[PDB]
Each structure stands twice: as structure tokens, then as C-alpha cells.
Backbone:
């Protein structure tokens, strides 16, 4: 048996548009040193340092430093812990969280608008998000379970249907917790 | 503020003798995620869609492939593609690395792979 682990201090980052930067902690929970390799992916941003040695059990800080202004944009911050017939396999965890670029022009927060998802079925269960925020669904059931996905702002997302017509969902709030359960008849 | 802790435990399977197919090479337990099966991607250098490739260390470049599966049979992406989408179990999920075979047909000796496990939280 061999254990691997990479912990990021937060499960998502809310990045205020044009902000100088934010700091996020990373921890090597493994008992061997690793190289921590950090990269930002599309769904312009600098991660310092992008590669550094993090010894066994050690934690360090990353700096993330910087788009439409009418809605959020989504990026992914990936943090990877790299080792610097017989079968030998080595693993490397690549821990990715949502980097949510949020204009100050935006009124409210996702939880204020989680209830406003409207739904229809064609083809596929379709959600409609009229809010300027990513609606990061963490729980979704239709007719009593659907692998959830975020609904992009001012946009739609089509889930595969898995004749009952209830849809229940929870978004993940800005703090990484599951929000209230909302339910509508479709 | 909830942290994103991702953990992985790898447990070796039975010794392999010259190969049988569907052999359990080893078991993986992925934990800490908040998360569906298509949110997990196991990648390696060979980059063979759906399979991890193990290569000999004798310079002869013998290779066999493996699939990664869990339970109804499910699968994370392997090199960007699913083999066999669901919500992962709470807390942790077991994945099993199972031999397929060798397309090239194997010397006894040591075989290796370096595998990246990408978890896209949420």
C-alpha cells in the first residue's frame, strides 16, 4: 500500500475581476517531498510559484494574480504533486478547483439566484440559468439522480435524462458548502 | 471555508505470472472529493484512450494495457475517455486496475507506469 495526497486550502476561488491577487494554501500531505506544479486552464492568470518543492507534510502559499463584466468567467486552478511480471506504478494527484472570476458590477451572490433555475425536457433535462453567475450544482435529481454539472451564467446546460417530473437541486455556495434544496415540477 | 483535500491509496494486487486477462493488477481508493466519474481522469505518457499502458524496463519496450473500473460497472476517464457517468460514492471510491493484455504479445521482468490522477472538483 502507498498513499498520496494534495490539499488546497479552498475548494473554489472567487476572484474579484481586476483584483491584484488572492492567496491560496497548498499542503503536501504525503510523507515524501513532491514538486508542486500549478497551472490555470480555460473552461492571463499567473500562479507564483508555478513549480516548487514542497517537503513531506509541509504547507505553502500560492499567489494567483490576473473578461466580460456582465457575468462571471470560469477557469480551473490545477495543483499537482509530482515525485521529483513485476508491476511498479507511481501516481501524481492533480487537484483542480474552480477559479471564478467575478465582476464587482454584479449584484448579489449565486445563493440569491439558485432558486431561479428554470427547467424543461427536450431530446435531455435542460436547465436555464438567467443569473450572471455560474450555478455550480452539487446535487441533482429528476423523477427521483443525475450526475450534476455547473450551469454557465445567462445560459443553459443539457443533462442526459436518466414519467415523474420533479427536479430537485442544491448549488454549492461560495464557501464550498451545499446550499438549500430547491424543488420544482417540470 | 471547505478545503479541497484529494487523497489516493494504491494497493498492490496478486503477483503476475506469464498474461491472464481481467487480472487485478491493483486497487485504487480515491478520497476527499466533494463529484462524478467524468470528473476524474487518469492519464499517462502513452496517452492511449481508455487504457493505462505498462512498459518493460529492459529496453525491449514490451507493453500491456489495463483498464480502470469501479462499481453496476462504471469508469473514470482514462486518457480523456470512459471505457464502461455516475455520482461517485460519498467519502471515497474504489477503482480497480485490471489487465487487458498485450497487443504486441511479454518477457518476464519489471513493468512500469507513471499515472496522473486529475480530479476536477464540483
Residues:
Amino acid at each position: 500500500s502507498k498513499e498520496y495526497g494534495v490539499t488546497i486550502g479552498e475548494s473554489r476561488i472567487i476572484y474579484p475581476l481586476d483584483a491584484a491577487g488572492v492567496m491560496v494554501s497548498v499542503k503536501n500531505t504525503q510523507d515524501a517531498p513532491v514538486l508542486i506544479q500549478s497551472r490555470i486552464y480555460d473552461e492571463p492568470f499567473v500562479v507564483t510559484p508555478p513549480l516548487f518543492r514542497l517537503d513531506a507534510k509541509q504547507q505553502n502559499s500560492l499567489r494567483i494574480a490576473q473578461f466580460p463584466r456582465d457575468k462571471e468567467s470560469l477557469k480551473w486552478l490545477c495543483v499537482k504533486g509530482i515525485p521529483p511480471v513485476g508491476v511498479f506504478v507511481q501516481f501524481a494527484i492533480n487537484n483542480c478547483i474552480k477559479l471564478l472570476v467575478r465582476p464587482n458590477e454584479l449584484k448579489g451572490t449565486p445563493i440569491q439566484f439558485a432558486e431561479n433555475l428554470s427547467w424543461k425536457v427536450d431530446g435531455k433535462l435542460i436547465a436555464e440559468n438567467p443569473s450572471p453567475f455560474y450555478m455550480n450544482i452539487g446535487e441533482l435529481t429528476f423523477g427521483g439522480s443525475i450526475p450534476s454539472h455547473y450551469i454557465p451564467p445567462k445560459s443553459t446546460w443539457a443533462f442526459d435524462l436518466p414519467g415523474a417530473r420533479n427536479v430537485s437541486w442544491r448549488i454549492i455556495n461560495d464557501q464550498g458548502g451545499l446550499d438549500r434544496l430547491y424543488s420544482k415540477n417540470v | 471555508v471547505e478545503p479541497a483535500r484529494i487523497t489516493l491509496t494504491y494497493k498492490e494486487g496478486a503477483p503476475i505470472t506469464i498474461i491472464d486477462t481481467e487480472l487485478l493488477v491493483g486497487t485504487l481508493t480515491l478520497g476527499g472529493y466533494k463529484t462524478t466519474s467524468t470528473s476524474v481522469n487518469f492519464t499517462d505518457a502513452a496517452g492511449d484512450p481508455m487504457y493505462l499502458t505498462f512498459t518493460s524496463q529492459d529496453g525491449n519496450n514490451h507493453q500491456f494495457t489495463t483498464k480502470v473500473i469501479g462499481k453496476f460497472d462504471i469508469s473514470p476517464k482514462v486518457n480523456g475517455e470512459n471505457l464502461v457517468d455516475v455520482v461517485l460514492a460519498t467519502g471515497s471510491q474504489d477503482f480497480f486496475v485490471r489487465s487487458i493484455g498485450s497487443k504486441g504479445g511479454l518477457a518476464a521482468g519489471k513493468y512500469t507506469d507513471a499515472v496522473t490522477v486529475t480530479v476536477s472538483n464540483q
Observations:
- Residues 27 and 61 of chain B are 25 Å apart (CA to CA).
- Strands of chain B lie at 4-12, 24-31, 40-43, 52-56, 63-69, 77-78, 92-101, 110-120.
- Chain B touches chain A through 46 residues (CB under 8 Å).
